[PDB]
């Protein structure tokens, strides 16, 4: 109805088909769908070199879907449970039919698995799409899981999204010294780096991918002959400065010599470094200037794809003119600009791996074919020998698991991509998803690309930063920001040939002409001539805006340079925007009664020029407006809503207005791990740190973006009555006097689970198979606290407080006690060195579930729900929704806490010392809309850039009997009379984080220095406790007291007075050294075993062994 409601109810309109996570699933859907067939187009067709041509030919490779549909879970259909318990993996075989060009003519077209696709959970092939929260029972899973993460041997592995810069694009930087035209192109294959440079005082050369040295450009232009060097100079430019500056290079070339192509190019014919592959050029003895020019078809190595070299000529001649930035000292082009950074995404990496694994398998098939010639049999290519099937399985799973997309064709052995979903709630289950990870940033500690550039207002969150090392380097793609995969360049080629974009083979170096705006970059691909940018661009927009070409094809019109791009390639961010129609937003204030109830079915606001999709570039053209209320009549697009730069994990604060930026960074880190209700699965599943609560409460000052997450059905923190009050010296630096009698009445339980996995192996020769079962059953504890609490069968114990290093499970462990060769005969399982699985911490767990989850191999797991209800104590972690992370200072009893007049006494207590220097005024308000929303029954909103102001809330508090300001009138329990100054109150929403003081119980009894690795108890694997590393002993030695330092030395790890010297003596006895008992060479010197290990390990690597003593006395 109003002017406003339309633009704030476009959210459930687009958040269904392409929303907040669904870019992951969209990309991988396409990559299952068609791009695998695309890679199939790289058919075999070469395999029979020494053969009567028995080529294979993939008829149609689909992900289990050539002629088939139900091949999408080919382990006898299996849910994600039966993949998160049995630890199995999703699997759909990438089946295919093959077209033997067989000389025995049996063209066999059986559907052959080629491996297995690890299907992204909830893709358009999984069994969890198009199903209701009732159908989500037989599949054991929530309806509202994020979805989009893989199944890696029972471990949820998401794929972080990288930020790799654009291909096909010049990068004309400006060093403090000189200009750099570095066109780092590609062909989906390799990082080819055909960079130009302003090398030596006006001297231009090409650090090509290979070429042995720096090649003067004018000779390069000769290599694509434009030999009339007049044409070189006129093409580069026509003004004074350009001609003069370029002059030196032509002068140097001519002074060398001016020849055509058949000479002066042997000057580069032999000067080529890809000549380094003399052995890689076995046939075609034809190798010199003319022949690296024959192989100069690949000396494209750039987007422009011609055989007559005029395209590469003009590319170099716009390179050479956009490196001389007309005295390129004032002109600067910056790297970190999200029109340049194009997101390669989980699916894209999987597409690289599709390509490379099919090509690797085809290469090994080719090798087998090229060795099988002596075989006079039919199985030169047959399916039976074609038997790497289901081993692309291992490649894919290794890639997704180890995080290694190890490659050869693409020049990247990337490690560090895939991670495990931090299922501490569903808040961090999303925050883990929808995360973008940075890239090279040449010196990552050079903080240029660390501050948030203004160049993605919208598309990346402002406040989602993990303070520390990954600040500004791991990024939450946190909202409405839709994403593009790829297009077809054809139906822009047609509109270029039509719309007034000439063919560049009709003109020469007129291209310094200001009417002739002549960037036409169809995705880097070459260029288009014709003038009239301000008509081509505008009619192209107003043609896609009316049902034609797909609304993603952004086009920038910059005037500093003659920039008119057509970027229709992948990695592009996006956003929706309301079309202003240059006078008034085209939603007409009455689309609501279509935006909500009946029709305009939806996304049909994209087929009507009503709301449209931008990029970064097109945002660099347009002129947006925040609200309608302040449109000024020159605006091209309109903001749907302000609150979607603050995104899914970051739009959890109430009133994120008023906080600082640091405070919202703190909160949007803390809120992730905070103990919460994982959802609906919880009990049916098994997983490590299921940090539940037991009595959680919905937020109560909520945000319109808390609803949209659906994760306000699953709130992560208790909703706590709270004062603002200073009790007695324990509160002080963000500490909390949480009263007992609310810990008692259940405020903030925990249900810390953990997980023991008795991976009961099997072995080839000897067997674990039958050997299960302790229960010796002696007298004391049937038998003993070794095997006291297991069961009849020693496996399970669903409900018994198994305590402090009892047995959770044991197994006699005969693994290889029989030697696999003809070894000892007697070890037919009397040789069990039993390996107990026992450990625990200093409190009782309670075995709650026992699992015999056994995959197809009998490799018995024992999954176990070791639940430990560690309710809080002095030291536990709180957060606040405002990066206000206090800790329980005291724990007071009920009767001492202040009571207002009604009878309310705090649960939590803060002191008003976290606010005035952090300035979270988003908390003095949350306690207004709590106490005003409950005292009235309401359920309030403070939403980013909207909310509910202070005046209406104040009047609500008035109506149910309190201040405008909600400041109660408290008397003090301790003494029994009114506090002198009033006391803030009302509901807060305290989250209860992980990282308590019970998971952090650690201490060390003794540390010696061992002999095995000759180490003290360093860090973990020996005990918990300390680790005096670099800065720690740096402080230790920096004291200023002599034998305080001496004591630290004498007690460091060990000070054994072993006997060793130089004069016929070594590391041996003292009284009578069997090494050398000369009886005059007894030393008994204090020394840690580390120096002795140095002695040993340097015996192999010879070095001067000085050894001597001196008198302590006079």
């Amino acid at each position: 109805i109003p002017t406003v409601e339309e633009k704030w109810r476009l959210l459930p309109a687009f958040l269904k088909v392409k929303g907040l996570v669904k870019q992951h699933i969209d990309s991988f859907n396409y990559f299952i769908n068609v791009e695998i067939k695309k890679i199939m187009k790289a058919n075999e067709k070469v395999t029979s070199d020494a053969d009567p041509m028995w080529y294979l030919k993939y008829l149609n490779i689909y992900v289990g879907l050539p002629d088939v549909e139900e091949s999408f879970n080919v382990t006898r259909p299996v849910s994600p449970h039966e993949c998160r318990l049995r630890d199995m993996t999703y699997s759909a075989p990438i089946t295919v039919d093959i077209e033997y060009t067989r000389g025995s003519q049996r063209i066999i077209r059986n559907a052959l698995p080629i491996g297995r696709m690890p299907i992204m959970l909830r893709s358009s092939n999984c069994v969890l799409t198009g199903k209701t929260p009732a159908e989500f029972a037989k599949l054991n899973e929530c309806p509202l899981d994020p979805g989009g993460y893989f199944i890696v041997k029972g471990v949820e592995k998401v794929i972080l999204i990288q930020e790799q810069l654009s291909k096909n694009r010049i990068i004309v930087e400006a060093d403090r010294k000189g200009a750099v035209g570095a066109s780092v192109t590609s062909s989906t294959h390799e990082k080819k780096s055909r960079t130009n440079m302003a090398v030596k005082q006006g001297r231009f050369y090409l650090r090509h991918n290979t070429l042995s040295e720096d090649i003067p450009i004018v000779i390069i232009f000769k290599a694509m002959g434009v030999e009339s060097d007049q044409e070189i100079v006129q093409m580069i430019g026509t003004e004074e400065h350009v001609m003069a500056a370029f002059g030196p290079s032509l002068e140097e070339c001519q002074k060398a010599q001016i020849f055509t192509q058949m000479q002066a190019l042997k000057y580069i014919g032999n000067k080529v470094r890809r000549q380094r592959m003399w052995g890689g050029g076995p046939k075609k003895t034809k190798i010199e200037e003319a022949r690296e020019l024959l192989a100069s078809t690949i000396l494209t190595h750039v987007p422009v794809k011609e055989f007559n070299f005029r395209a590469k000529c003009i590319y170099t001649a716009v390179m050479v003119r956009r490196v001389i930035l007309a005295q390129g000292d004032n002109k600067v082009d910056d790297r970190d600009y999200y029109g340049n950074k194009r997101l390669e995404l989980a699916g894209q990496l999987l597409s690289l791996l599709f390509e490379d694994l099919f090509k690797k398998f085809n290469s090994e098939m080719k090798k087998i074919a090229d060795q099988v010639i002596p075989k006079q049999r039919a199985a030169q290519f047959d399916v039976v020998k074609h038997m790497r099937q289901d081993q692309i399985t291992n490649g894919m799973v290794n890639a997704i698991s180890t995080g290694n997309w190890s490659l050869k064709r693409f020049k990247m052995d990337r490690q560090g991509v895939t991670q495990v979903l931090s299922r501490l709630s569903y808040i961090s289950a999303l925050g883990m998803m929808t995360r973008i990870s940075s890239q090279f940033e040449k010196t990552r500690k050079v903080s240029g690309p660390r501050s948030l550039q203004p160049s993605q207002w919208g598309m990346l969150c402002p406040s989602d930063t993990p303070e520390g090392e990954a600040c500004g380097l791991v990024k939450n793609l946190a909202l409405m920001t839709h994403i593009t995969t790829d297009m077809e360049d054809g139906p822009i080629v047609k509109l270029a040939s039509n719309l007034g974009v000439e063919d560049v083979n009709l003109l020469c170096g007129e291209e310094l002409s200001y009417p002739n705006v002549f960037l036409v970059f169809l995705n880097g691909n070459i260029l288009g001539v014709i003038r009239d940018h301000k008509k081509l661009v505008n009619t192209f927009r107003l043609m896609r805006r009316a049902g034609y070409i797909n609304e993603f094809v952004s086009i920038s019109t910059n005037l500093t340079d003659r920039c008119v791009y057509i970027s229709s390639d992948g990695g592009r961010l996006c956003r929706p925007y309301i079309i202003v129609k240059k006078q008034k937003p085209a939603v007409t204030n009455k689309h609501m009664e279509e935006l909500a109830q009946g029709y305009r079915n939806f996304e049909d606001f994209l087929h009507e020029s009503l709301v449209e999709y931008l990029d970064v570039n097109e945002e660099n053209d347009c002129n947006i407006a925040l609200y309608e209320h302040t449109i000024n009549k020159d605006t091209t697009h309109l903001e749907i809503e302000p609150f979607t730069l603050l995104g899914v994990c970051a739009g959890l604060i109430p009133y994120p207005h008023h906080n600082q930026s640091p405070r919202n960074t703190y909160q949007c880190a803390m809120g992730k791990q905070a103990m919460g209700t994982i959802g609906y699965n919880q009990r049916n599943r098994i997983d490590t740190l299921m940090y539940l609560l037991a009595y959680p409460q919905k937020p109560m000052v909520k945000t319109k973006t808390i609803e949209l997450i659906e994760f306000e059905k699953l709130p992560a923190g208790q909703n706590a009555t709270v004062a603002v009050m200073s009790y007695s010296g324990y509160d002080i630096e963000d500490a909390l006097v949480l009263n007992k009698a609310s810990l008692d009445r259940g405020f903030g339980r925990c249900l810390v689970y953990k997980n023991a996995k008795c991976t009961l192996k099997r072995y080839t020769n000897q067997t674990f198979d039958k050997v299960m079962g302790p229960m010796l059953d002696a007298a004391t504890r049937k038998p003993i606290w070794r095997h006291e609490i297991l069961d009849a069968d020693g496996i399970c114990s669903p409900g018994e407080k198994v305590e402090n290093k009892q047995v959770l499970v044991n197994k006699s462990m005969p693994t290889v006690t029989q030697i696999p060769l003809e070894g000892s005969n007697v070890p037919q399982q009397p040789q069990y060195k039993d390996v107990p699985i026992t450990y625990k911490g200093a409190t009782d767990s309670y075995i709650e579930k026992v699992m015999i989850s056994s995959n197809a191999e009998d490799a018995f797991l024992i999954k176990m729900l070791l639940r430990q209800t560690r309710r809080p104590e002095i030291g536990d972690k709180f957060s606040s929704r405002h990066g206000q992370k206090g800790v329980c200072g005291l724990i007071v009893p009920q009767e001492d806490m202040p009571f207002c007049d009604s009878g309310i006494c705090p649960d939590i207590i803060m002191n008003p010392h976290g606010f005035p220097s952090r300035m979270t005024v988003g908390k003095l308000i949350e306690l207004l809309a709590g106490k005003a929303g409950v005292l009235d029954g309401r359920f309030h909103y403070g939403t980013a850039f909207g909310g509910s102001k202070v005046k209406d809330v104040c009047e609500d508090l008035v109506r149910h009997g309190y201040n405008y300001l909600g400041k109660d009138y408290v008397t003090s329990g301790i003494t029994g009379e009114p506090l002198e100054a009033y006391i803030y109150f009302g509901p807060v929403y305290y989250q209860k984080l992980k990282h308590m003081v019970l998971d952090k119980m650690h201490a060390r009894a003794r540390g010696p220095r061992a002999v095995l690795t000759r180490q003290p108890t360093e860090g973990r694997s020996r005990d918990g406790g300390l680790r005096l590393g670099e800065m720690e002993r740096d402080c230790l030695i920096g004291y200023g007291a002599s034998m305080l330092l001496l004591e630290r030395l004498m007690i460091s790890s060990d000070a054994f007075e072993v006997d060793v010297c130089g004069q016929c003596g070594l590391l041996g006895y003292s009284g009578w050294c069997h090494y050398c008992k000369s009886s005059c060479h007894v030393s008994s010197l204090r020394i840690p075993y580390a120096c002795k290990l140095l002695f040993q390990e340097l015996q192999s690597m010879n070095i001067i062994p000085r050894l001597k003593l001196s008198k302590y006395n006079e």
Partner: protein, 64 residues
């Protein structure tokens, strides 16, 4: 998961008052007035019902 029997900071008994609202949200008072016909005249128990998520039903949907 289930209803706190006591208002963590009040004392009042609560768990007796969840199968009345699911019968007083269909007499269709405003929540603020389904929680005045049952006694809750303070902050506390208003939180302890208005804010709680009965995961009991949805969890038990597939318990076995």
């Amino acid at each position: 998961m289930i209803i706190p029997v006591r208002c963590f900071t009040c004392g009042k008994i609560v768990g007796n008052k969840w199968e009345a609202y699911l019968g007083l949200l269909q007499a269709e008072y405003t929540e603020g007035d389904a929680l005045d016909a049952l006694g809750l005249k303070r902050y506390c128990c208003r939180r302890m019902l208005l804010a709680h998520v009965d995961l009991i039903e949805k969890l038990l949907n597939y318990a076995p």
